[PDB]
Amino acid sequence: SMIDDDGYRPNVGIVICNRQGQVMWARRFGQHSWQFPQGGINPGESAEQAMYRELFEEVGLSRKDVRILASTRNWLRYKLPKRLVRWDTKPVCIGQKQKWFLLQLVSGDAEINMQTSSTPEFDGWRWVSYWYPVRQVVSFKRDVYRRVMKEFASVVMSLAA
Ligand SMILES: Nc1ccn([C@@H]2O[C@H](COP(=O)(O)OP(=O)(O)OP(=O)(O)O)[C@@H](O)[C@H]2O)c(=O)n1
Ligand SMILES: Nc1ccn([C@@H]2O[C@H](COP(=O)(O)OP(=O)(O)OP(=O)(O)O)[C@@H](O)[C@H]2O)c(=O)n1
């Protein structure tokens, strides 16, 4: 996605839950750091379209495999640690502004395929407890994750009853 006037790239994030209130947790490709799926919003994409493209390209799933249960309204932003800022572009990107989606997986676990890209976002995934991501994502994304998971909590725990 294109860097905006303030240095932020527009992006979407995806929290995928099951009926037991667990959420899909994925290992960043070639790292031991885990996160939710996130991807850029291209010009002429809506947030929801960009979400479904991320879902297909990095999780292998269709609209028909999920249902949308909630979404955040306005951007939430994180800034990159200055060490990880890439200076090989103009304008330089300092972080992301993100819109988030809560999806329920309704197809079988085996429909998820994280290996279809030549450069996958992830090595693979596992189910984790709902709040585990807030404490386990890389530090500079924790403020965003805490806000997202708090906003989505009302909907997920009702399913887990
Ligand atoms: N746990 C993490 C998260 C991020 N990064 C680094 O910080 C950059 C920015 O991370 P992020 O904002 O999550 O975006 P990307 O992973 O680069 O993904 P995208 O191409 O969709 O922007 C990454 O390229 C990576 O070098 C990292 O090293 N370890
Ligand atoms: N509670 C928060 C956290 C973040 N933000 C927005 O999201 C960006 C990322 O937040 P943060 O990393 O915490 O900013 P800092 O680099 O710590 O400090 P400064 O932003 O003042 O240069 C902020 O610029 C802000 O616009 C916000 O409005 N309210």
Swiss-Prot record:
Pfam families: NUDIX. PROSITE patterns: NUDIX, NUDIX_BOX. Keywords: Hydrolase, Magnesium, Manganese, tRNA processing, Zinc. A motif (Nudix box) lies at residues 39-60. Its cofactor is Mg(2+); Zn(2+); Mn(2+). The keyword Amino-acid biosynthesis does not apply. Magnesium or zinc. Manganese can be used to a lesser extent. InterPro entries: Nudix_hydrolase, NUDIX_hydrolase-like_dom_sf, NUDIX_hydrolase_CS, NUDIX_hydrolase_dom, RppH. Optimum pH is 8.5-9.0. It is an enzyme of class 3 (hydrolase). One of its GO terms (biological process) is RNA destabilization. Disruption phenotype: Altered 5'-processing of primary pre-tRNA transcripts with short (<5 nucleotides) leaders; in the presence of the truncated inactive allele encoded by rph in strains derived from K12 W1485, including strains MG1655 and W3110. In the presence of wild-type (catalytically active) RNase PH no effect on processing. No effect on growth rate, a slightly stronger effect is seen when combined with the inactive rph allele. Its EC number is 3.6.1.-. One of its GO terms (molecular function) is RNA NAD-cap (NMN-forming) hydrolase activity. Coiled coil: none annotated. GO terms for cellular component: cytoplasm. Residues 7-150 form the Nudix hydrolase domain. The keyword Hydrolase applies. Master regulator of 5'-end-dependent mRNA decay. Accelerates the degradation of transcripts by removing pyrophosphate from the 5'-end of triphosphorylated RNA, leading to a more labile monophosphorylated state that can stimulate subsequent ribonuclease cleavage. Preferentially hydrolyzes diadenosine penta-phosphate with ATP as one of the reaction products. Also able to hydrolyze diadenosine hexa- and tetra-phosphate. Has no activity on diadenosine tri-phosphate, ADP-ribose, NADH and UDP-glucose. Monomer. No interaction between this protein and catalytically inactive RNase PH was detected by immunoprecipitation. Belongs to the Nudix hydrolase family. RppH subfamily. HAMAP family: Nudix_RppH. This is RNA pyrophosphohydrolase. It comes from Escherichia coli (strain K12).
